[PDB]
Symmetry: D2
């Protein structure tokens, strides 16, 4: 009862660096994912997949724009694309990525799990860049393209294109990026105030990341 | 030579209905042309023209990006094409072209001898308006079946060829009801000659071609 | 090592739905052959040397990959080198004897095992293997169980490959013996269970050894 | 109505050079025909003829089954096609067709004005012989690059287009060297009209089309 299968992410674009071969299996009933060192198999049911198109999620836009359908026995990917509404305002997603970037600058740069911190920083930077580009009417997901289409300080370094520095250097790059996009910290200081801010603004990835410390 | 090849149109969506199998060959240097049989359309573009259609945000380029099935691409030209796409907020230029031609056909085309071309061009006008309005609202709809559902205006289904042999009286009132249901206004013209010069001033190529086709743009 | 190439195979590559699992072959340098499964997906890994070796050996799995696999991507050309290495043999007697010999062990010691679904699965593997190998010897490229039953219409093949049902242990053993009779099969010169083990070892019947020890690097359906 | 579509030939192998982009369209009721531009070939067959080529074990059907990329298939006809394939043990008929046409081209065709067509037909003869011999040995090779390695007879890589603006006597010496190296024998013919009747009696369809046009996958 896997009714449809799609290649997405870097392999869909024909990229090979970094990345991770990503496949989306559409199956009724059951949203988990099983991954190895270089593979990732995501499962979604049709209601969830269509909901992400209805909501205009950046991930849905990527699937519609770059996903390669391997098979589809039910037409669920046709219905997915017919439900897609690309929004004109991604300010909510942009603010989520801005706010989490400040959290990581303020509290994450000496964390034990450096790999997770670097990956979430990359997510913040990609999210801001993709969403800003969607607002201007362009559909860019490739990290190489993002650095050229969203020219801001250290974008290439931060989304992993250029990655084994020390804490001071990583923090300065992230601060230079945030200054370059004229970003300002939310009205918080402590980690606990970041938690409350993430809750009020319903920043799910911020909350997942903050507690986790305790790409396509 | 042929750098890349893409299935587009109805066969790219798995539709076999009026089912023209359409393939886009990207070939360096060559002018844009097409070789077509009863059931196939093989269209040739060079990379510069393909990328320009993306830069321009052409409806056809949006279709290729969101529905085209890449068969092969030896140069990455379809990646560069998608990175050049700029979807506009305002498709009023295309909408007015289809609107303006629709009024021409209403006024002068419904008694024309070439009934087939008239009905084909009416369907182009309606599909163009429907697709453009849906793109303005953030959607990626191109299937004629979906256009009728997603752009639920008067007589859309009949006017884009979803059955097909109605007389001249009936076809004219359907077109009139559609234009009314989208709050369309006839351009400031009356005679056929005034349409010609209006079509020329507004650079309505399809309008001029159609008008100068009824005397003496295929769906994707 | 990185994933050079990815191929859809098995029932999903044939457009056949069910139960069946979606099977995918990932080619990656360095790693030993291993699989990663869910209820409905099977992800197999091979390095290029092992993939090319199966082509050079004319393995039935390699023939299936070459004639039915759907390449999802291939950044190194490894699947072309694979196809250029395939040598389809005239004689699959060795594969046929493997399926024959495991069938006789199952007939003799497996029909009352508690793990009945594994026994039925391995019976189906024996029949499919014999059918596929005989058809390849005659120049055909058949792997779909539906088509196997029509192209290799020996006794009870449809039922023994799972194209129906479940019934009692008696009828199952009767069906299996009748299929072995219809292909003029003779039991190998063994009697006890350890004699089957030694015979599987001498003949290098990897699936026979895996099955026998499994009833008290596995074969994957395609 | 086109019920299925398949990419074949060099493009299906991800091979470029110049070799056209080739697509096979399956549509019912029509007789076989093709539409060609300089760089595309669009071949039309009905299901019955496609299935028949598989039952006959034609080299073209082997290539479609082994290397063709299905673009769409609304009826399952490519499945029934592959179930009908019987790969033969003996490709002597096809080998003799390629040998015989090679002798015609050597003895009568090298002087045709349409040198481009002659070189293409020579390459067809050499590829057909090599492919058929390899299939007899259980190998499924269609790529010209690989045919030259796996069937290394005299001048093979030259003759299948991997080297070509050579004059007529040079190309002629190469073809003669190839035929001698595979111990080929001229048919017992001594004129164009005798070649026509020989091609007819041996049912050498490509031979007859070549001769008449003078006088891929």
């Amino acid at each position: 009862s896997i009714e449809a299968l799609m290649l997405f992410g870097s392999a869909a674009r024909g990229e090979s660096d970094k990345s991770a071969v990503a496949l989306l299996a559409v199956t009724s009933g059951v949203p988990f994912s099983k991954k190895t060192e270089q593979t990732e198999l995501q499962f979604l049911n049709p209601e969830e997949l269509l909901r992400s198109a209805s909501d205009g999620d950046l991930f849905a836009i990527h699937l519609a724009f770059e996903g390669k359908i391997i098979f589809d026995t039910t037409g669920v990917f046709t219905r997915f694309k017919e439900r897609l509404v690309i929004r004109k305002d991604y300010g909510r997603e942009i603010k989520w990525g801005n706010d989490l970037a400040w959290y990581l600058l303020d509290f994450g740069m000496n964390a034990e799990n450096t790999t997770l911190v670097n990956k979430r920083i990359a997510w913040c930077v990609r999210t801001i860049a993709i969403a800003r580009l969607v607002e201007s009417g362009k559909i860019i997901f490739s990290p190489r393209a993002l650095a050229k289409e969203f020219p801001r300080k250290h974008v290439s370094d931060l989304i992993g294109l250029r990655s084994d520095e020390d804490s001071q250097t990583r923090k300065r790059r992230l601060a230079g990026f945030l200054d370059s996009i004229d970003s300002s910290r939310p009205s918080v200081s402590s980690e606990q105030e970041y938690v409350s801010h993430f809750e009020r603004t319903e920043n799910r990835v911020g909350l997942q990341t903050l507690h986790g410390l305790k790409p396509y």
